[PDB]
Design a protein around this ligand. Structure first.
Ligand SMILES: CCCCCCCCCCCCCCCCCC(=O)OC[C@H](COP(=O)([O-])OCC(O)COP(=O)([O-])OC[C@@H](COC(=O)CCCCCCCCCCCCCCCCC)OC(=O)CCCCCCCCCCCCCCCCC)OC(=O)CCCCCCCCCCCCCCCCC
Ligand SMILES: CCCCCCCCCCCCCCCCCC(=O)OC[C@H](COP(=O)(O)OCCN)OC(=O)CCCCCCCCCCCCCCCCC
Ligand SMILES: CCCCCCCCCCCCCCCCCC(=O)OC[C@H](COP(=O)(O)OCCN)OC(=O)CCCCCCCCCCCCCCCCC
Ligand SMILES: CCCCCCCCCCCCCCCCCC(=O)OC[C@H](COP(=O)(O)OCCN)OC(=O)CCCCCCCCCCCCCCCCC
Ligand SMILES: CCCCCCCCCCCCCCCCCC(=O)OC[C@H](COP(=O)(O)OCCN)OC(=O)CCCCCCCCCCCCCCCCC
Ligand SMILES: CCCCCCCCCCCC(=O)OC[C@H](COP(=O)(O)OCC[N+](C)(C)C)OC(=O)CCCCCCCCCCC
Ligand SMILES: CCCCCCCCCCCC(=O)OC[C@H](COP(=O)(O)OCC[N+](C)(C)C)OC(=O)CCCCCCCCCCC
Ligand SMILES: CCCCCCCCCCC[C@H](O)CC(=O)SCCNC(=O)CCNC(=O)[C@H](O)C(C)(C)COP(=O)(O)O
Lengths: 78, 155, 93, 506, 49, 137, 183, 80, 192, 105
């Protein structure tokens, strides 16, 4: 609970000490906070790019895997 | 709007621009406090306190104790910002997409009529079930007490 | 380690000597100080102290009245050159 | 026996005055404590009853006939080690007073022995991370025992930093295994050996690889060993490997349950590199301790080939190898600590500075040892020849048995490389033997009263005064003939290796 | 109450505290997920039979 | 249970901290008001160290440095007795006997520092005396 | 104890914010084939007041429900629903009985408990009135198993631990019955 | 962007700075353990965390004790 | 292997010391005086100072006896323990153990004894001390509690072996002996 | 054998019961191999992480999109703020939407 009290002081001292640097790191922080608020889909797609290149099981691959299982089982009944 | 993220972004900046041993010590405190606070909420309140009583109360004020006996002497801004912005793109330490983006719940039960603190259980196990761990740790602390004297005491 | 050699002292010695009133601009090992350069007590002390500021070697009282040539100073620096002790940060990290 | 008397020595140590005679006699009490521990241990522990493996202390520690033997090995090497400080090695006070100044030298050793013996027995991750620290800290304290020295302290600071990184790597792997399974005990984890992430046990070994100095982490071990005093390097370059190679073998025994092919390749990559660096490394070096540090890396490389293969022939190979390399390492460092009395004295060139901590530091300080003390030189030559692998010395069977387990499991590449690195290494073991004897006849007619041994006064000039202490000379003589004459008892001793079991049973 | 079960932000966003041999394997190696994906896939393959 | 009231208190103290910072920057009279002679940065004479008036140009002893280092063990000992405080009953006699052992091991550490006099600041650099003795020849 | 869990409301809304906790309702009901039952509608103070009286009246039915759990071998919630309704109906019986027989003494007790942090030691006077009235209308006697009869805590004449603040209604009702009933 | 070893830039350029980084790294393993112990509702994991805090405390003392003796060595002339 | 009868897989501290054969005290006798002797013998093999024999300080002869005393006890303690586990000859001990256990059962008292530990702590104190002697060289630990996880079947004390019919013991069934698992859970299966 | 998975009150936690049945299955003498206990080990890991269960929720969320179903009409209604668990939302007959007291119990 100590940071909640110390947060008002340090944020003030971040803009006073390094005003140009403060306007970016705080400004950049608000972008991603807004991005998740507004479902911009950016950080999600930056994430999906990494999982594709590094061979991870992506979200799209699982849903494609379900389609292959779904399409196979349905024709098995016929 | 998790304000925990902003604080780490600041700490991820002063760590790169740290110059003298004043800055590095302040990194340790500025790492402990986000640890202590995020544990006070969320996961475990008992260990949010156990950090402060031991980390800050024993080691960190011993860090600044010895540092006053050591020494006090002495790319740009766009690269440091560029390093942070690329480093900030991915922040999912795990890669189980189902385990991250799906929420769960637990069902409470009334069987434990003997409600006790998490520290009482730890004492009830560390002092009875795993007494050997406790007695070895005492032995290690004994080694340090004799160890620390022999290294420093010249005579 | 002592990275100074005899030539390194000799090459940089002239530049300091070129910075003070010298009768001849030709100075080498054989060149003297009082005779060739016409330096008296106070004149010679400034050059000797100046070489202490560049070569970072202190000349004692025993050698004070026993200096007669500029080759001796150049050879003296090698016998009396050490690197200043570096703090724990510089040495190992 | 250790815990009861270690506390007695700690209290008794500071009660009496600080005098080198009282410290030395207190060091002997350290020898008596270790001797009793061995008798008490051998009395209650047998190979027949420990074949199954007997859980102890709420299943925190598990002991079987394999870990039991290494505990007996650790205690015996320590008994020979304490003879280096409990008795005179050279006799001259100038060089032997370094071993008697520090009172807490023996206390720290007994702290490490408790850590050394319990490390192979760990059966839970909670006690693994503790016991590794009890041993690890005892190393850092030991390396810094001589705080007046500048090199010894800088060794411990360098040792502390790397050892802490290795501890964190070990800690992180155990936390990762705990996060996947939620269990702590290793026997509980064995149930889920097919469902945990197997590489987390590799991350655990990468922590243990750092502590024994395996390439590419070899850099610090060579630096540390070359700097610490010879009395210290004899203990920190051998003991940590005794109690960690055994733990690595037990973990590798568990990992081979699934027989992961990817994990063998990564470890084989480290084994292959270590033989390269351990062989080509020592070709161009001038320090004797740096050479033996590279020899240690190569012989750790050979043993890890047996551990990786991990079959019924590996136990026979690893048990025999660890015993023979330990005695040989004691034999060489016992000789180097004694032949410091033949050093010449000036009456300059290169301004070579020799300190009382490491009187023998360069290989060329062994010159004319064939002339000064021929019997000692032959003991040194025999010890050197064992590491080369000249049959029928103990060293030859060590490589013969490792190759049997290595080739039995399909390690054809590593076996051929192990042989090439055995041939390359022979160059810088022959250099030691060239220094001793190759100039004997050109220096047979020499006038030299300028030895260190010549400083001692002549007591009677009639009675025969031996040049060396009784105890230290007898240890060298006992170990020299064991290496040379092992051919007699080899068939019986190897039979003793057949009986060692690690969950083989049937 | 339904909630998430993610690690603390300081664990996965400190410039130093997020670097360890096992954390890099979690974050950049597919070996853990490929095995643990098969169990999930087997849930749907084992229904119709 | 329920710490929303405590949370607001933590917020209030944090907000109250800035009020200590900011109130001075607004209440104080500006430099031109008192003497105008110079700003804090410009007034080097005032914005300088105090050394009793005269201008001048911590290598602490071993004991002070040794007391600080020994604080770390003994503090971990005390702070590790917390589990026994909240469970002194349930562990019963077995915990009590374990607890006493956990101290008797640490008493030997206490005993060891007592005998060697490691804590004392010590005075060896000075306070030396000798007895004058005639040397008749 | 007060540790953050995933089953009930945690300490502060910040904890809910960090965990992104959602409080989820279910609009369905129990399936038709499962017989309906009227849940007990008493809060903490009434139950803590009547915990022992519920035990005396429902002792055979508490045990069967808990014995059913043991014999269900981990399948308790589905294999002990029929037994679960027996305990609920018996518990509702006592609360209704205390409401039509000892209504005055009942409210005096649990209102004392709400006044004094639900601690049983702070409402002895409001409890002695309730025990006597219950024994004369429902034959239910409070008993604490395991110890002798004459060592039960609520019968101690001089308890060492007394409330800091005396309840006024407890004192008035005690003194009102001090001379009238206990002549 | 950790595979480029970015954390080495964030470390200071003194021996005391290396000590800090190790303790931060060890603290990362405790926070993970408390994460695992709490979610599983396991008190065995919280015992492990208590041991990690205690053990990592001792390692801090031994490191600074060595560093203080090492630093005293350079300024150990003591001529007066 | 030279197995024998398993008297007690977790022998109690008081019973291990009681069953010390006269040879076992002799071992303890040797170890207590062997340690001062070994210090003397070491000076014989090589003196600490000089080249001549010099008896070590009387102060050292006192501490060495203490090390030998606490050292020689464990050799006796380990020798006695192997007779309980079945690793050593225990014909003498089996006769003694069966007589006492039969006497305990005959008097309607538990063979193990009354305990101050609740049923969990008895189980916990079994796991901590059982087989601890295998590490008694490294550090001490003893079974000082009256628990019941001794790894035996008490019916082996019912049947009468050779040379035991003279004791004239009468043994009640196990469900009537104080302080036993089978005769404790009569009201609640959760509590003794 | 040492305890694992001890809840915060000193007794077994949620996933200990599934842990005990694995230990009983493995150490039993009747089993020739460990093949029988393969499903028991899969349940224990399911209890701790619910990874398979979370996967089934991922499909249901994904599948609800492709048919055009809206989570408002299929999902479970929820309240996100702990001070707005109003008595009207709770279903109390006389209840009103005012904020409930969560400042101090
Ligand atoms: C790397 C770090 C290493 C760390 C290591 C740290 C050190 C570890 C070593 C210490 C071991 C730690 C274990 C301690 C935890 C135990 C706690 C516990 O069990 O509490 C229950 C236990 C009581 O519960 P209980 O089951 O009813 O036992 C009753 C009797 O005490 C016992 O019942 P009994 O039937 O066996 O005997 C009853 C009667 C004797 O009954 C007899 O049968 C008579 C035997 C003949 C004796 C012959 C002469 C003996 C001398 C006269 O009286 C006794 O003699 C009691 C035995 C204790 C004697 C002294 C033990 C010293 C050991 C050293 O607590 C105790 O009283 C223990 C007393 C010993 C104190 C601790 C000793 C260790 C220190
Ligand atoms: C927005 C995105 C942000 C992403 C953050 C990270 C950005 C990328 C940073 C560099 C990434 C390089 C490493 C990539 C991940 C590690 C390798 C890996 O996990 O595999 C991924 C990739 C291909 O793997 P793949 O075949 O698809 O696996 C599918 C199996 N079903 O494996 C590869 O083939 C990669 C090629 C690696 C081989 C060449 C490099 C190795 C040789 C140089 C190593 C450097 C020296 C190290 C020496 C070791 C020390 C002993
Ligand atoms: C109550 C909050 C008060 C905050 C006061 C400082 C605010 C500045 C922001 C620092 C906090 C960011 C986290 C990084 C830790 C500090 C590392 C650092 O470099 O601090 C820099 C600080 C400002 O100086 P600056 O000009 O910006 O940098 C070049 C200085 N030659 O120069 C310094 O070296 C700091 C001098 C004071 C050191 C006091 C101890 C450090 C602060 C501990 C309490 C703050 C806890 C962390 C709060 C933020 C968490 C992310
Ligand atoms: C000191 C040497 C004493 C050797 C005692 C070794 C021993 O007794 O342990 C034997 C052990 C296997 O035996 P085990 O089945 O465990 O139990 C029965 C014990 N006979 O086998 C082992 O594990 C022993 C492993 C180490 C083998 C070392 C061989 C002896 C070392 C050379 C002794 C040098 C003598 C120097 C004497 C100096 C005197 C001043
Ligand atoms: C008929 C039976 C005979 C049996 C032996 C047959 C094989 C012998 C092989 C010898 C052939 C090469 C040796 C002679 C070539 C000269 C090499 C050399 O001197 O270095 C050249 C080059 C740099 O040039 P420079 O330094 O200027 O040297 C000029 C010398 N004229 O520097 C280089 O190019 C060095 C190349 C890099 C080093 C690569 C090392 C890889 C491993 C090489 C084998 C080592 C063994 C590996 C396995 C054992 C250890 C694990
Ligand atoms: C709580 C304390 C209450 C008592 C002190 C009140 C003084 C504040 C008013 C004040 O400062 O009035 C004078 C001022 C400015 O004039 P100045 O001489 O430059 O003041 C210097 C003050 N700075 C630092 C703000 C420039 O006027 C105002 O702009 C009033 C707003
Ligand atoms: C009775 C059965 C037990 C056998 C004795 C065992 C211990 C030896 C003590 C004897 C007394 C003593 O050491 O006396 C001292 C002698 C002689 O010393 P020196 O070299 O001539 O020195 C000069 C002495 N002056 C001045 C008297 C001449 O040293 C020896 O004998 C050394 C023998 C080495 C020990 C052999 C035992 C090896 C055991 C191996 C098990 C792994
Ligand atoms: C930062 C504050 C700085 C403040 C700075 C303060 C400067 C202080 C000035 C000191 C003045 C002092 O009182 C007088 C003096 O130096 S004593 C020289 C007097 N001399 C004699 O009595 C006869 C001998 N004379 C010689 O030997 C030669 O004249 C000479 C000295 C030049 C040698 O040179 P050589 O022969 O060419």
């Amino acid at each position: 609970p100590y940071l909640v009290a110390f947060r008002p002081a340090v944020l003030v001292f971040f803009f006073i000490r390094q005003p140009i640097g403060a306007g970016l790191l705080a400004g950049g922080f608000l972008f991603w906070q807004a991005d998740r608020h507004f479902n911009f889909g950016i950080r999600d797609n930056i994430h999906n790019f990494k999982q594709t290149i590094l061979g991870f099981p992506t979200q799209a691959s699982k849903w494609e895997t379900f389609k292959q299982v779904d399409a196979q089982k349905r024709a098995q009944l016929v | 709007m998790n304000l925990e993220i902003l604080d780490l972004s600041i700490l991820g900046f002063y760590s790169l621009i740290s110059s003298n041993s004043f800055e590095s010590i302040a990194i340790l405190v500025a790492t402990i406090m986000p640890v202590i606070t995020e544990l006070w909420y969320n996961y475990s309140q008992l260990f949010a306190l156990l950090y402060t009583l031991i980390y800050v109360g024993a080691v960190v004020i011993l860090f600044v104790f010895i540092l006053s006996v050591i020494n006090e002497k002495e790319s740009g801004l766009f690269i440091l910002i560029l390093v942070l912005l690329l480093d900030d793109l991915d922040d999912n330490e795990s890669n189980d997409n189902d385990y991250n983006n799906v929420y769960i719940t637990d069902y409470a039960d009334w069987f434990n009529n003997y409600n006790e603190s998490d520290l009482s259980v730890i004492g009830n196990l560390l002092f009875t079930e795993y007494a050997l761990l406790l007695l070895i740790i005492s032995f290690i602390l004994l080694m340090s007490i004799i160890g620390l004297i022999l290294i420093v005491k010249k005579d | 380690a002592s990275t100074l050699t005899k030539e390194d002292v000799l090459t940089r010695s002239v530049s300091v000597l070129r910075g003070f009133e010298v009768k001849t601009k030709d100075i080498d090992l054989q060149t003297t100080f009082v005779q060739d350069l016409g330096m008296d007590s106070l004149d010679l002390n400034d050059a000797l102290v100046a070489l202490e500021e560049e070569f970072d070697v202190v000349f004692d009282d025993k050698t004070a009245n026993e200096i007669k040539t500029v080759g001796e100073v150049v050879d003296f620096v090698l016998a009396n050159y050490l690197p200043t002790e570096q703090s724990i940060n510089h040495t190992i990290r | 026996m250790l815990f009861t008397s270690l506390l007695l020595i700690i209290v008794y140590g500071s009660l009496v005055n600080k005098s080198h005679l009282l410290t030395k006699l207190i060091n002997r009490l350290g020898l008596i404590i270790i001797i009793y521990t061995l008798l008490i241990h051998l009395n209650i522990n047998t190979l027949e009853n420990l074949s199954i493996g007997i859980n102890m202390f709420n299943n925190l520690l598990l002991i079987n006939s394999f870990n039991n033997t290494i505990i007996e090995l650790i205690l015996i090497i320590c008994i020979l080690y304490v003879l280096l400080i409990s008795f005179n090695i050279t006799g001259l006070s100038i060089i032997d007073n370094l071993n008697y100044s520090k009172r807490t030298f023996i206390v720290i050793v007994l702290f490490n022995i408790i850590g050394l013996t319990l490390l192979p027995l760990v059966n839970d991750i909670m006690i693994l991370f503790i016991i590794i620290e009890l041993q690890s800290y005892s190393l850092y304290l030991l390396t810094a025992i001589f705080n007046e020295s500048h090199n010894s302290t800088k060794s411990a600071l360098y040792y502390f930093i790397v050892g802490s990184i290795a501890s964190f790597i070990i800690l992180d792997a155990t936390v990762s295994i705990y996060d996947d399974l939620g269990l702590t005990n290793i026997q509980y984890i064995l149930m889920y050996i097919d469902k945990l992430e197997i590489f987390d046990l590799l991350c655990l070994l990468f922590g243990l690889f750092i502590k024994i100095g395996l390439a590419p982490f070899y850099s610090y071990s060579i630096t540390i060993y070359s700097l610490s005093p010879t009395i210290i390097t004899n203990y920190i370059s051998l003991m940590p490997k005794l109690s960690i190679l055994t733990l690595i073998y037990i973990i590798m025994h568990y990992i081979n349950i699934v027989n992961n092919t990817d994990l063998n390749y990564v470890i084989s990559f480290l084994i292959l590199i270590s033989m390269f660096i351990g062989s080509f490394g020592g070709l161009n070096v001038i320090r004797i301790k740096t050479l033996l540090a590279y020899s240690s890396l190569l012989n750790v490389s050979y043993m890890l080939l047996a551990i990786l293969s991990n079959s019924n022939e590996s136990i026979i190979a690893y048990i025999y190898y660890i015993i023979q390399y330990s005695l040989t390492h004691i034999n060489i460092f016992s000789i180097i600590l004694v032949i410091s009395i033949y050093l010449p004295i000036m009456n300059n060139m290169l301004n070579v500075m020799i300190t009382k901590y490491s009187p023998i530091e360069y290989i060329n300080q062994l010159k004319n040892l064939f002339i000064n003390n021929i019997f000692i030189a032959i003991a040194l030559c025999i010890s050197i020849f064992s590491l080369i692998g000249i049959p029928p010395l103990t060293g030859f069977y060590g490589k013969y048995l490792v190759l049997i387990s290595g080739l039995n499991n399909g390690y054809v590449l590593l076996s051929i490389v192990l042989i090439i690195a055995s041939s390359i290494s022979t160059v810088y073991y022959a250099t030691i033997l060239k220094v001793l004897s190759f100039d004997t006849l050109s220096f047979k007619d020499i006038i030299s009263n300028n030895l260190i041994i010549n400083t001692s006064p002549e007591n009677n000039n009639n009675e025969i005064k031996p040049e060396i202490s009784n105890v230290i000379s007898y240890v060298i003589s006992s170990l020299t003939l064991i290496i040379l004459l092992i051919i007699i008892q080899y068939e019986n001793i190897v039979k003793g290796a057949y009986l060692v079991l690690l969950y083989n049973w049937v | 109450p339904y909630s998430n079960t993610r690690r603390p932000w300081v664990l996965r966003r400190h410039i130093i505290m997020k670097n360890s041999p096992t954390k890099w394997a979690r974050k950049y190696s597919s070996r853990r997920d490929e095995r643990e994906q098969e169990i999930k896939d087997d849930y749907i393959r084992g229904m119709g039979e | 249970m329920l710490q929303d009231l405590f949370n607001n208190y933590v917020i209030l103290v944090g907000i109250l901290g800035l009020i200590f910072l900011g109130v001075n920057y607004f209440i104080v009279e500006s430099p031109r008001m008192d003497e105008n002679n110079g700003n804090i940065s410009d007034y080097i004479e005032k914005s300088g160290p105090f050394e009793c008036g005269f201008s001048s140009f911590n290598p602490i002893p071993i004991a002070f440095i040794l007391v600080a280092l020994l604080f770390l063990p003994f503090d971990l000992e005390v702070s590790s007795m917390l589990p026994y405080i909240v469970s002194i009953y349930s562990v019963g006699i077995y915990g009590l006997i374990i607890f006493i052992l956990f101290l008797l091991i640490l008493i030997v550490g206490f005993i060891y520092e007592f005998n060697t006099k490691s804590l004392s600041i010590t005075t060896i650099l000075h306070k030396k005396n000798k007895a004058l003795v005639k040397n008749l020849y | 104890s007060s540790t953050h869990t995933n089953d009930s409301l945690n300490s502060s809304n910040y904890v809910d914010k960090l965990k992104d906790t959602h409080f989820v309702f279910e609009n369905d009901k129990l399936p038709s084939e499962i017989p309906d039952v009227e849940e007990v509608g008493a809060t903490t103070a009434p139950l803590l007041s009547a915990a022992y009286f519920i035990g005396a009246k429902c002792q055979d039915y508490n045990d069967d429900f808990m014995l059913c759990q043991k014999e269900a071998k981990g399948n308790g919630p589905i294999d002990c629903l029929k037994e679960g309704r027996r305990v609920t109906r018996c518990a509702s019986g006592v609360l209704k009985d205390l409401n039509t027989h000892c209504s005055d003494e009942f409210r005096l007790h649990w209102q004392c408990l709400s006044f004094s942090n639900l601690e049983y030691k702070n409402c002895r006077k409001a409890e002695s009135l309730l025990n006597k009235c219950v024994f004369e209308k429902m034959n239910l006697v409070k008993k604490i198993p395991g110890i002798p009869e004459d060592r039960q805590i609520h019968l101690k004449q001089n308890p060492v631990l007394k409330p800091v603040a005396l309840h006024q209604d407890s004192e008035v009702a005690f003194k009102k019955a001090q001379n009238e009933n206990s002549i | 962007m950790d595979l480029i070893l970015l954390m080495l830039v964030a470390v200071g350029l003194n021996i005391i700075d290396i000590y800090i980084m190790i303790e931060i790294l060890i603290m990362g393993c405790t926070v993970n353990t408390i994460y695992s112990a709490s979610l599983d509702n396991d008190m065995i994991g919280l015992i492990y965390s208590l041991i990690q805090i205690i053990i990592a405390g001792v390692e801090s003392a031994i490191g600074l004790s060595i560093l203080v003796n090492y630093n005293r060595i350079r300024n150990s002339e003591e001529i007066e | 292997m030279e197995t024998y009868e398993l008297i007690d897989s977790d022998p109690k501290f008081s019973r291990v010391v009681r069953y010390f054969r006269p040879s076992d005290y002799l071992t303890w006798a040797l170890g207590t005086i062997g340690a001062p002797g070994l210090m003397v013998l070491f000076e014989k093999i090589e003196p600490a100072k000089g080249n001549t024999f010099k008896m070590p300080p009387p102060s050292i002869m006192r501490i060495a006896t203490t090390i030998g005393f606490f050292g020689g006890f464990y050799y006796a303690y380990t020798s006695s323990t192997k007779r309980f586990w079945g690793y050593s000859e225990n014909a003498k001990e089996v006769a003694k153990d069966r007589y006492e256990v039969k006497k305990a059962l005959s008097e309607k008292k538990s063979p193990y004894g009354s305990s101050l530990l609740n049923p969990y702590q008895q189980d916990m104190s079994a796991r901590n001390s059982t087989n601890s002697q295998l590490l008694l060289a490294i550090f001490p630990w003893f079974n000082v509690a009256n628990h019941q996880s001794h790894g035996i079947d008490l019916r082996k004390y019912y049947e009468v072996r050779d040379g035991e019919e003279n004791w004239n013991f009468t043994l009640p069934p196990l469900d009537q002996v104080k302080d036993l698992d089978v005769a404790q859970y009569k009201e609640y299966s959760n509590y003794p | 054998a040492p305890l694992q998975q001890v809840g915060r009150h000193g007794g077994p936690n949620k996933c200990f019961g599934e842990f005990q049945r694995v230990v009983e299955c493995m150490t039993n003498a009747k089993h020739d191999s460990y093949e029988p206990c393969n499903n028991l080990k899969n349940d224990y890991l399911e209890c701790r992480k619910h990874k398979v269960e979370r996967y089934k929720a991922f499909l249901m969320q994904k599948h609800a999109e492709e048919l055009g179903k809206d989570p408002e009409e299929i999902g479970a209604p929820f309240v996100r703020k702990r001070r707005f668990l109003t008595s009207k939302t709770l279903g109390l007959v006389d209840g009103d939407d005012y904020e409930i007291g969560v400042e101090k119990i």
